[PDB]
Amino acid sequence: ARVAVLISGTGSNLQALIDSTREPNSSAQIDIVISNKAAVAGLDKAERAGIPTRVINHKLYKNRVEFDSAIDLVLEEFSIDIVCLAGFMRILSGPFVQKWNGKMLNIHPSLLPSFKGSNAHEQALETGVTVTGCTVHFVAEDVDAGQIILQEAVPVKRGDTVATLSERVKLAEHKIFPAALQLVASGTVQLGENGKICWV
Ligand SMILES: Nc1nc2ccn(CCCc3ccc(C(=O)N[C@@H](CCC(=O)O)C(=O)O)cc3)c2c(=O)[nH]1
Numbered sequence: 001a002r003v004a005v006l007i008s009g010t011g012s013n014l015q016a017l018i019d020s021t022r023e024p025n026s027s028a029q030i031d032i033v034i035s036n037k038a039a040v041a042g043l044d045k046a047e048r049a050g051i052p053t054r055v056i057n058h059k060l061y062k063n064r065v066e067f068d069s070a071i072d073l074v075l076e077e078f079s080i081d082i083v084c085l086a087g088f089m090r091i092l093s094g095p096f097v098q099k100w101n102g103k104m105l106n107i108h109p110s111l112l113p114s115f116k117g118s119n120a121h122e123q124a125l126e127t128g129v130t131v132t133g134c135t136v137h138f139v140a141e142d143v144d145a146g147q148i149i150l151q152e153a154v155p156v157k158r159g160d161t162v163a164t165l166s167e168r169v170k171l172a173e174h175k176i177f178p179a180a181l182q183l184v185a186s187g188t189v190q191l192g193e194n195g196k197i198c199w200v
Pocket residue numbers: 085088089090091092093097106108116117118139140141142143144146
C-alpha cells in the first residue's frame with residue numbers, strides 16, 4: 001500500500017516508519033512525506049532515505065478546507081492508499097477526514113480516551129497517573145470517535161518532566177505505529193462496516 005506521512009516536527013516516528021517499511025516483509029511503502037512547517041528536522045530524514053517531500057504552509061490559505069485541498073492534491077498525485085499523521089499538528093476538515101475514513105492513522109502520546117488533545121504529557125503529569133502510553137487509531141472527525149488500532153502502556157517514573165516522559169513514550173510509538181501501519185496495509189485490520197475496528 002502506498003503511504004504518505006504528514007509531519008510537523010522532528011520526525012522520529014517518520015524514521016520509525018521508514019525503517020520498518022524498508023524491511024523486506026513490509027506491506028507498505030512511503031512514497032511521499034508532506035510537512036506543513038518548513039526547515040523542520042523531519043524533512044532531512046525524508047530526504048536522507050530518498051523520499052519525495054512537499055511543504056504546505058497552512059499559514060497561506062484562507063481556511064482549513066483550502067489548505068487540506070492542497071494536501072489532498074499531492075496525495076492523489078502520488079496515488080496514496082494510506083495517510084500517516086506522525087507529529088502532524090493541524091486539525092483536518094470534515095470532508096478531508098470523511099474521504100480518508102478508514103485510510104488515515106494517527107499516533108497519539110496517551111492511552112486514549114485519556115488525555116485527549118495536544119499537550120497529553122502535560123495533562124498526564126498534572127493528573128499524576130502511574131501509567132501513561134500511546135495510541136494508534138484511525139482518524140475520524142471527532143478526536144474521540146477514531147477507532148483504536150493498537151496501544152502500549154508506559155510507566156510514569158517519579159520526578160518525570162515532559163522532556164523525560166515524552167522520551168520514554170516515544171519508544172512505544174516507534175513500536176506500535178509501524179505495527180499498526182503493517183496491520184492496515186496488509187489488509188489485516190480494517191475499519192468495519194459498523195465503524196468499529198474489524199480484524200480478519
Ligand atoms: N479532524 C481531525 N484532525 C486531526 C489531526 C490530528 N488528529 C489526531 C488527534 C490528535 C490532535 C489533538 C489536537 C491537535 C491540535 O491541537 N491542533 C491545533 C493546534 C495547532 C497548533 O498548536 O498550532 C490546530 O490545528 O490548530 C492536533 C492533533 C486529528 C483528529 O483526530 N481529527
